[PDB]
Amino acid sequence: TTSAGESADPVTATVENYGGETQVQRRQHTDVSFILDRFVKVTPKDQINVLDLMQTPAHTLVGALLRTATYYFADLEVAVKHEGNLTWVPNGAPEAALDNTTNPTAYHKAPLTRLALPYTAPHRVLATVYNGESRALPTSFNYGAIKATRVTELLYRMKRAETYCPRPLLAIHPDQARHKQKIVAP
Amino acid sequence: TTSAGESADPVTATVENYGGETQVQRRQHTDVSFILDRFVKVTPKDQINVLDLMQTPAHTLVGALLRTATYYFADLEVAVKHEGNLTWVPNGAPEAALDNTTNPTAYHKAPLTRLALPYTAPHRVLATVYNGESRALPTSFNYGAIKATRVTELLYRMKRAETYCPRPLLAIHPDQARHKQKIVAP
Amino acid sequence: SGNTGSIINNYYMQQYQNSMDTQLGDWFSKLASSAFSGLFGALLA
Amino acid sequence: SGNTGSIINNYYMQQYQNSMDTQLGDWFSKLASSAFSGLFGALLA
Amino acid sequence: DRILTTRNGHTTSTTQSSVGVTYGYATAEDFVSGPNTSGLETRVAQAERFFKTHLFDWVTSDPFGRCHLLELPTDHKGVYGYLTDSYAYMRNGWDVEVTAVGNQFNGGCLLVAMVPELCSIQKRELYQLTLFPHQFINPRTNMTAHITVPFVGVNRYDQYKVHKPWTLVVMVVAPLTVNSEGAPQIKVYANIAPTNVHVAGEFPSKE
Amino acid sequence: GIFPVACSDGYGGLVTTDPKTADPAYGKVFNPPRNMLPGRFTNFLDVAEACPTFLHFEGDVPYVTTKTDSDRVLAQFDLSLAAKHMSNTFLAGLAQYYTQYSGTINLHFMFTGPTDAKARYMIAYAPPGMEPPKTPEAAAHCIHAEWDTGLNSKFTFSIPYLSAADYTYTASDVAETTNVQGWVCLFQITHGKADGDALVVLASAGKDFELRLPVDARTQ
Amino acid sequence: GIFPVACSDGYGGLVTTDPKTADPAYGKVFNPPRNMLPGRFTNFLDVAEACPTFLHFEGDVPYVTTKTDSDRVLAQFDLSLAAKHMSNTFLAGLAQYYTQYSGTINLHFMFTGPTDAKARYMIAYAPPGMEPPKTPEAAAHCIHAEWDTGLNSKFTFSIPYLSAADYTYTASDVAETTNVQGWVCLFQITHGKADGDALVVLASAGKDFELRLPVDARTQ
């Protein structure tokens, strides 16, 4: 389809332009609320872990796909394998309130304890990047902090996820003619 | 019943032809969806196992009875006794994606972890034999791969099974007048 | 329906349980039911 | 609705499960559906 | 009461000793309009005619199970085999017709079978070749066997350079028993024909 | 409080044939379409009833040869699905994975001789209890049937299912060597110039043949 | 008594993608309002279909330069979403997290030459099975399309999805080096005083492009 090449309005020259027809296309596996609510591993510290979603790595699935959005809203539920007792603390409380047990602790039940946390940020929508102080994110961009005796592996997933204002997403650079990796085979 | 001996249309000379009558016959135990959805043992490797159904043995029940079909469609659910964590991977992902935990792991819950997998093949119907490269099956004929620290015994069963285009089924060859084996008795 | 034996409804809906089939737009039961029987010639009692 | 697969109702009500949203008083689906197609000039067969 | 003369396209095949045509696995064709081809398929009506081939010489010294396996499609040096080197994806049925002309004084019989995906067989497996689309030939009754099958396959369109779905199989069930008045050696021929081919995807020219 | 249950004992172990379905882990999968795809079978008996498969005789052959002597016994094989003659049949292929059956077993008899060779045959069912008959005179008193070779060259005889019990074992007993389910005998009565000519036989599932109780006794 | 249950075995382990939601611990939270906030996308394909993104050529550039010699091949790249040319595209950014796809891939071709330079081009799709064409004479027998540079300076050609199977793998095989999904070739046929002038290309998701089966194969 010949177009106006610079107006940057969307054009889709479909396959009917040279004969043929299009089929019914289903897009459930690329939905933004379906692709983001599954568990991802992050590396923990020993005791205190702020529950920021931008400490998910950039090589994983829903860490590199969360950074597709500029602004995101999602309720977090965590799943942490620990020993001792794990106290969750809401957004913006003093970090001395991690030791107190009136805050929502979870007693140790083998092997791990998963629990659903609300969106406790003051902002209407969180963000993945912010040019305010030249890390380089405010202290308000967190779901709170969890503190145990020694956390071993704590996992994030983010549900009811709404995303806004897309950002570029990068696949790794081939040095060959095409990036050929060893696919699974019998 | 005298017939045309070479037309190869079905003829059933019933027992009424020399007096008598036929009874009501029930065929639930020979249904193809009933006889195939039960657990069968396959031998595992140490860590990585592609979930091909043609690695079931040829002496077992639903391995020798799956090879009755040329083309089959069936959803697989596995049951694996392992230690560590067992990550399932869909069809055609790179085998380096077995280590990542965003893929559907199952944490170790004693003694074994059974989980239902969908038909992830690209083809409309899988097959049990294929003359494409002269093992001798494409890399697309699998339900994916599972990877643990050390799998001990992993079991297949195949449900909603549809079969097409039957193949010959062989019973073992007697050397006597009749194959007499030791049947169970008090 | 298979080898199920539960009268209760399933917990997971239909699409988190199986793979959904898609229509586009059997044989040997029709082959075994068209079988010739009786005789071929004039029978007696 | 998400990645849920349960036909039963939830046990905890709605406000001990999620954070309730508040109204006050989408885009790229409208952007991708206003895409121009066909041709630009007089076509032939 | 008999209509016993088939034709495909502009070629006919009259036999007077037809016991009947056996439709294997289907009486009608599948939906040719798939979603894996985006509607860029087209029927080539000029591929539907017979083409003859030689199979073997059934002699009196052949025991049980002298089988012959030719993979369809074979080397077609006409219109149909031009489509194999000019189009990437194509599908078709087949309607085979083997002839074993002796006379009505020979004996024995040979089974004919169209079987999908056939490789690595045993002679102990030959006892159950009846499961496939089959039709017996004995010289006491008939001379031909006329089998018709649709396109089977793992997926809707096929790459015939890397895959051969069907396999015409003739094996000898009873040996050829000549007599004082029979025919010594019979030769098995076959004329095969495609049905409703559909190609999709033009190769670039070799120049 | 919470809803009290009792975690009952003895229940909940992993059984390999149970109707419990496993919990899903990965949803929203839409298969490629498969509708009206050719060659589908639903039950394994319909393949066994619509497609007859050959038998096994002495010399690894499916055909039986006419006999030009005073002895007129073409074949005499015991009636079981674990027999020696029934071994390469598809009907005894899937009856190796069950325990017991009932119903008729069709036997198909195609004559492959020339147009000048004529013969007639008989097939009788000798129920268990005494020795099977060795002459067509003695086997006239069974539930028999005769046919001669003419224009239609195929004969189908449905073996009756006679038994005390309602179901009979498809596995012949290992120690018990009398084969107390039955014999089936087929003879020739005469033949005209049919020397060296064959009679290829076949077997199929009957109209009311149905199997029962699947096991896995390792494919002999 | 109490209601007896059977604590079933094999079920209840922690699966990372399950539709089980975790029990809450801290209720009565009312979020700040977010309604009618600008720039929301719902599915990742709508971003990939409404926003085309550049390709990658030799020299880390998105544009391809006209060729003033006898050879007329501007670009010839294999058709996969793990290709070298498709690597910096957003369409192959999210197709790095799936296993298999189907559908058309739009290619957008904007000519950035001056008003006196004129040229015409062609783009052909060579399906797999033999060597890709090296001349526009040989590539006339593909599913091709031509366009010349005039007032509207942009051309969009939708790559057809031809395959045996219904879905094709978005990851090119590690060992298998033939790339049996297909090639796409774009040539120049002629040019008038278009030396040193560019043709910037783009790629977008098609009208019926849809991905399938998400995995996490670590971001190359």
Residue numbers in the entry:
A (entry chain 1), B (entry chain 1): 1 to 134, 157 to 208
C (entry chain 4), D (entry chain 4): 15 to 39, 66 to 85
E (entry chain 2): 12 to 218
F (entry chain 3), G (entry chain 3): 1 to 220
Article, verbatim:
Structures of several serotypes determined at near atomic resolution have revealed a capsid composed of 60 copies each of four structural proteins (VP1 to VP4). A prominent feature of this otherwise rather smooth capsid is an exposed flexible loop (∼30 residues) on VP1, termed the GH loop. This loop and the RGD motif embedded within it (residues 145–147 in the O serotype) comprise a major site of neutralization by the host humoral immune response and mediate FMDV binding integrin89101112.
Subsequently, for O1M only, we tested the effect of 2 mM Mn2+. This resulted in more complete decoration of the O1M particles than with Mg2+ and the Mn2+ data were therefore used in further analysis. For all experiments, the micrographs clearly showed bound integrin and no evidence of capsid dissociation. Conventional single particle analysis assuming icosahedral symmetry, yielded density maps for the complexes with the virus capsids at 3.1 Å resolution for PanAsia (13,438 particles) and 3.5 Å for O1M (1,649 particles). In both cases the integrin density was visible but very blurred.
